[PDB]
């Protein structure tokens, strides 16, 4: 049962996941099981484990709807590196999109990144600390911790089109460490976990990578207003709201 879950993880474990990450993953597995139950994304810890093994992540509509409230309150966030940001504009196989074209971009709630990434006194945390919080490699935010932000209204009118998705096991960009429950696996420290949804990708066609960073260094942000998004069916469409590409500061 859990035994079955432990057997799948070894089966699908990606080359990049370290013995340390693997140890912590299996070790703390049942806390993520129970977090799933407490959010009422699942009935039992057993159900969580079956779902991981089966790769089909289904949720009750009642739960998904309650989640999207916090998203709708202060909007959405996706923390990224300068390096990966650049890759979105300059990597030609991606077709100038922030996200995986029609497959979307992973995000959390904006309120969660704000509370989790910031000191209560209002100061941004160490790159070293945030790297830890996000379960990424040491030094991946050394030259800045940047952020994609969908504002509250952009999010609100996205939901209206019906374009918010949940992550599942066959979702492009999912891997061994992806997890049922609309929740990221953030290592041994589970209270650094956050919600995960899939919002549609922003088109940044014709946009220049170097321009965006210069524009961000000059002001602290760069914005797209009435952004063209990409729906699952893949059509390009404009949606009323704001999308900022910030470098985060105090």
């Amino acid at each position: 049962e859990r035994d079955l879950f432990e057997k799948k993880f070894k089966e699908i474990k990606d080359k990049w996941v370290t013995d340390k990450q693997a140890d912590e993953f299996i070790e703390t597995a049942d806390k993520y099981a129970d977090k799933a139950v407490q959010m009422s994304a699942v009935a039992s810890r057993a159900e969580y484990y079956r779902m991981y093994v089966s790769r089909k992540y289904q949720y009750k509509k009642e739960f998904v709807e309650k989640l999207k409230q916090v998203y709708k309150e202060s909007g959405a966030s996706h923390v990224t590196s300068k390096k990966d940001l650049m890759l979105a504009f300059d990597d030609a196989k991606r077709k100038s999109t922030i996200g995986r074209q029609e497959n979307g971009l992973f995000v959390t709630s904006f309120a969660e990144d704000m509370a989790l990434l910031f000191t209560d006194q209002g100061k941004l945390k160490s790159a070293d600390q945030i790297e830890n919080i996000k379960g990424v490699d040491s030094g991946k935010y050394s030259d800045g911790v940047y952020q994609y932000e969908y504002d509250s209204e952009l999010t609100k009118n996205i939901d209206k089109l019906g374009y918010i998705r949940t992550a599942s096991g066959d979702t492009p960009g999912a891997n061994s460490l992806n997890i049922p429950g609309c929740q990221t696996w953030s290592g041994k420290h589970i209270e650094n976990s956050e919600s995960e949804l899939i919002f549609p990708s922003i088109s940044v066609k014709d946009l220049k990578s170097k321009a965006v960073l210069a524009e961000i260094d000059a002001k602290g942000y760069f914005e797209i207003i009435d952004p063209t998004i990409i729906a699952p069916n893949g059509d390009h469409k404009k949606v009323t709201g704001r999308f900022k590409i910030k470098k985060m500061q105090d």
Partner: protein, 161 residues
């Protein structure tokens, strides 16, 4: 300029030897689960990510003395470039792309692939109708999830060369 990044230390180890042409193929392609080298947020998770192989695999070993890796990847790319196979050619094209994306960020690299031959082979390959049809319709694995086609993707990258 390029400095060896922290993280993914086990990759750094795998290339600290004389790796054959033929094993560098398995690696750069990643059909095989045991030679599939990716990072957490690679674009696709079900085939190798050359960028990760260069950034964390080939370059640190090269600084640390293992200079044979250069001429070997060159031969590896040569063969896979002239293979008549979609993924082979796709991922070769993706390797030269990797160099460019890494040059982008780091602004200088420990070495540069001499590619006239690989690029000639890529160019001859892409004027083959069979090969283009192979690419136009290659939908194995994660490629099934993009309306955007392998051919479309490869063509867009060549324009950057």
């Amino acid at each position: 300029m390029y400095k060896v990044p922290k993280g993914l230390e086990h990759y750094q180890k795998m290339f600290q030897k004389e790796v054959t042409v033929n094993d560098l193929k398995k690696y750069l392609i990643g059909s095989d689960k045991e030679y599939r080298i990716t990072r957490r947020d690679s674009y696709m998770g079900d085939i190798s990510d050359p960028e990760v192989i260069l950034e964390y695999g080939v370059y640190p070993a090269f600084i640390k003395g293992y200079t044979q890796l250069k001429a070997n990847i060159e031969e590896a790319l040569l063969e896979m470039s002239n293979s008549g196979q979609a993924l082979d050619i796709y991922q070769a094209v993706q390797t030269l792309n990797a160099e460019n994306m890494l040059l982008n960020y780091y602004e200088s690299l420990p070495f540069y692939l001499n590619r006239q031959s690989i690029l000639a082979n890529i160019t001859k390959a892409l004027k083959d109708a069979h090969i283009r049809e192979a690419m136009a319709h290659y939908k194995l694995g994660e490629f099934a999830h993009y309306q955007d086609t392998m051919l479309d993707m490869v063509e867009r990258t060549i324009e950057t060369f």
